[PDB]
Amino acid sequence: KVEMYIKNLQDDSYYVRRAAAYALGKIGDERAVEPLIKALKDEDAWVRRAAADALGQIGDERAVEPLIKALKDEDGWVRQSAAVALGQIGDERAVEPLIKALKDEDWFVRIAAAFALGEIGDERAVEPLIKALKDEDGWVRQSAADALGEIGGERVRAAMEKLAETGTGFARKVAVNYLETH
Amino acid sequence: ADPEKVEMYIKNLQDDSYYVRRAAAYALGKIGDERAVEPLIKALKDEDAWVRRAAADALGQIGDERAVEPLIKALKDEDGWVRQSAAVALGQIGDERAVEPLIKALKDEDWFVRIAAAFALGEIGDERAVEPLIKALKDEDGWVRQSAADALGEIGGERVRAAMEKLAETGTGFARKVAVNYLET
Numbered sequence: 001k002v003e004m005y006i007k008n009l010q011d012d013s014y015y016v017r018r019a020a021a022y023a024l025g026k027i028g029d030e031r032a033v034e035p036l037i038k039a040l041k042d043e044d045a046w047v048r049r050a051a052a053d054a055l056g057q058i059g060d061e062r063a064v065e066p067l068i069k070a071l072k073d074e075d076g077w078v079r080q081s082a083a084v085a086l087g088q089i090g091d092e093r094a095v096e097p098l099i100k101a102l103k104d105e106d107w108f109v110r111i112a113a114a115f116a117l118g119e120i121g122d123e124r125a126v127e128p129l130i131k132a133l134k135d136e137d138g139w140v141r142q143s144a145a146d147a148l149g150e151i152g153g154e155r156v157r158a159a160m161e162k163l164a165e166t167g168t169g170f171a172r173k174v175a176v177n178y179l180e181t182h
Numbered sequence: 183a184d185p186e187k188v189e190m191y192i193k194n195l196q197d198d199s200y201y202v203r204r205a206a207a208y209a210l211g212k213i214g215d216e217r218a219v220e221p222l223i224k225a226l227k228d229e230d231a232w233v234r235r236a237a238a239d240a241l242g243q244i245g246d247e248r249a250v251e252p253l254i255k256a257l258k259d260e261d262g263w264v265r266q267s268a269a270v271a272l273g274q275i276g277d278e279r280a281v282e283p284l285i286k287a288l289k290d291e292d293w294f295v296r297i298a299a300a301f302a303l304g305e306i307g308d309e310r311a312v313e314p315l316i317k318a319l320k321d322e323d324g325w326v327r328q329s330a331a332d333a334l335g336e337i338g339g340e341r342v343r344a345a346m347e348k349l350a351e352t353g354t355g356f357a358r359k360v361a362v363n364y365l366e367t
Contacts, residue, residue, distance in 0.1 A: 013359070013363070015331075015356075015359055015360065015363060016363070018328065022332075046324075046325065046328060138232075139232060142201075142204060142232060145201070146205075146208070170201075173199065173201055174201065177199075177201065177202065177205075
């Protein structure tokens with residue numbers, strides 16, 4: 001029963017809270033939303049990440065600001081799942097925090113931020129995602145390219161024309177392909 | 183990803199630009215049209231790690247048995263993240279031929295692969311994973327420790343209960359914590 005789990009989320013055994021979190025997500029009702037938001041502050045990083053992940057699957061906008069704060073979690077993997085969850089939700093309040101996350105320490109979270117930014121589809125990400133095309137990590141470059149395509153639209157096309165004309169390297173290839181394929 | 187472009191994407195799996203091959207593999211995964219099965223299997227051999235991974239992930243989603251032997255080979259990829267997707271994919275497909283290879287992936291040098299292998303083994307539910315997973319409770323990584331417990335959970339049954347009984351008696355650390363909890367519940 002979700003209220004058992006909702007209560008389990010406070011158990012002394014991190015092993016039990018871990019199980020609660022993962023569960024409240026697979027079978028998530030709105031009842032689970034507020035408890036899970038509290039679990040984003042759990043001592044155990046696993047619990048945090050399972051909570052971020054659940055809340056994304058639930059889709060309730062109440063989690064938006066609490067997740068935005070998790071984009072600053074000590075653990076890179078929970079930041080990763082926060083970014084993804086924000087993407088899923090996907091409230092436009094996440095946009096600017098997610099754009100800041102494009103410069104995260106961990107490549108795997110920069111990928112998540114680009115992906116989320118693309119899912120949300122707010123053109124504010126266009127310029128930051130273009131800069132992300134010159135990221136030191138080749139897989140986040142890739143994820144920045146994919147996100148731009150997911151966003152689509154006039155500002156992206158315009159930004160791509162710019163790059164096709166005077167840009168270079170991966171960015172140029174991305175832009176030439178973009179307008180080739182539209 | 184445009185469902186009406188499958189044939190284009192398939193062609194694109196052989197494009198000169200890794201960028202176009204990546205895009206193609208990823209698209210066929212979202213689609214996900216059974217026509218892409220043998221071409222995605224071919225993409226498991228691409229020079230580019232991103233496209234191999236994209237390919238492994240796509241094959242798992244489609245669920246075609248043909249992808250099993252090739253994904254098994256992919257568990258020996260030099261890139262840990264394609265190994266991870268290969269493991270995940272093999273769990274999704276559920277074909278029992280993956281059980282022994284996934285058992286050996288329990289000892290992968292990369293923690294995130296061990297986690298994927300543990301999870302797949304629990305999804306397949308084959309009981310030869312019980313003792314390997316029990317040993318995995320002693321993994322140096324706390325997260326792969328966790329995934330082996332969850333996996334043993336999903337497998338359940340008499341053999342697992344039996345092994346849990348023993349750990350409650352003589353086990354130590356997290357493995358002990360897990361067994362006594364398995365009993366309590």
